[model samples]
Target: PREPRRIVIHRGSTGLGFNIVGGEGIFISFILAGGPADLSGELRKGDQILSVNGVDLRNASHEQAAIALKNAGQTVTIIAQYK
Candidate 1:
């Protein structure tokens, strides 16, 4: 297995945001730059983000999300629901 998977944090396409729509959840649909986000992996492009550091990513700002990613210590812990 690889150590510390690098994540590609993307800016929301529908404009600057940190949300994934759904029941709702932050949905994803990788339109470019594929990798783990495209394959059966830990995260996905359209994956509905459940939270960002306990903060609801659905209502989070891109900056807030980035902060959560930074606060993750040494590992990524992005909570989300697959769409």
Candidate 2:
């Protein structure tokens, strides 16, 4: 199901608790157990990240997306979907 999902995550002391990879399109590569993203219960590995905190990542490079995620602050809102 390619249903669009909105997930709001509160960053843990460690971090967002997930990593993204890919160019031209960002994807959730892996999620840390008991992390912020993992606790969200909506994010999944392989899900494509469309935007973070309203910053579009659909056409962003890996570095660009990485920066965006880094500066997303404590509360993060992510727009994504799975294949």
Candidate 3:
């Protein structure tokens, strides 16, 4: 199978993060909590966010991405996989 690049939308209140750490699989924290994903079903915590509001963050700066995630209304979309 093709490698899964996990995405993370961390709306840091501290403005000190934007690293996606779920390349292996979706973690519990990213599983349950509704950070990027709205926890609409089983979209876990470790889920990655490839794009934000349809805006891809692949080239966006850390701060820019995080800030966008934070201000992404009440819920942000996500795209991720498991290890």
Candidate 4:
């Protein structure tokens, strides 16, 4: 189940203050205030992060997801599903 996707939680001059909660397929959750995710005004509180920088994350772990995010560099194009 997925919905209208695409949101950029850009890591401009700050940190991407959000964490993924999942045993298998990483889901974006707990978006911190005044952080990249919050400032973007896009990503929802409980959205699934499908990919980072175009890299699929269906089989990725939470830690692996973190790695992918870090490797995304200054900006990250996060494919998120709200439904």
Candidate 5:
């Protein structure tokens, strides 16, 4: 199978309103209601954040992921993988 690419934007907050952790990869725990990431129908609860913009987040820390998104401006191209 192929990987998935998602471009998200947070007009107000820097956060995606989702809790993420890094183990095997960066996994999304949950998405907040009516948040920036919640607007995207392409995401899942257990999805892995493979990369952000062009930087790889595989096996990266939660802080790293957060930093990537925070510095991604209003446009965030998040590459994720999900079953």
Candidate 6:
């Protein structure tokens, strides 16, 4: 398995410009075109997010992960990888 890569995205007026799904193993299921995540060019659909702003997502439920991301603040740093 490849090592997880760090991705830092500056939140835009439209938020993180991305959405996550899945439980126990959160994954990025969508990315708004030209949005912060899209602009960062570091995230992609199906990318598994290991952590967000220090909050671990490996064992989190869908709602738990969502809340973690929501409160992640303007500058978000996530560790993720494509599997």
Please write out the lDDT profile of model 5 over residues 1-83, one tens digit for every residue.
55676656464565667778665778888878788878867776888888888998986788988898778777778888874
lDDT of 3 by residue, 5-29 (tens): 4444444344323244422332334
lDDT of 2 by residue, 1-83 (tens): 76788888898796899998894689999999999988858888999999999988899999999999999999989899875
Q: Write the per-residue lDDT of candidate 4 for residues 1-83, one digit (tens) a residue.
A: 76747777668665788877883578877888888888867876677788888998878888888999988988788888784
What are the per-residue Cα lDDT tens digits for candidate 6 across 1-83?
Answer: 87899889899796899998894599998999989999968888999999989888899999898898889999999999877
Given candidate 4, what's the lDDT at residue 37?
A: 88
Where does model 6 exceed 4 Å of error? none
The window of 10 residues in a row where model 1 has the poorest summed lDDT is 14-23
Ordered from best to worst lDDT, the candidate numbers read 2, 6, 4, 5, 1, 3
lDDT of each: 0.47, 0.89, 0.46, 0.80, 0.77, 0.89
Reference-based lDDT, residue 63, model 2:
93
Candidate 1, 1-83: lDDT as tens digits: 23323344433333322333332344554434443233334565566655654566666555655565556443334566654
Q: Any runs in candidate 1 off by more than 4 Å, and if so which?
A: 1-40
Off by over 4 Å in 4: none
> Which candidate, 2 or 5, has the higher lDDT?
2
Better of 1 and 4 by lDDT: 4
Could you tell which candidate, 3 or 5, scores higher by TM-score?
A: 5
Candidate with the larger lDDT of 5 and 6: 6
**TM-score of each candidate?**
0.45, 0.92, 0.43, 0.83, 0.79, 0.92
lDDT score, candidate 4, position 33: 81
**Candidate 1 structure lDDT:** 0.47
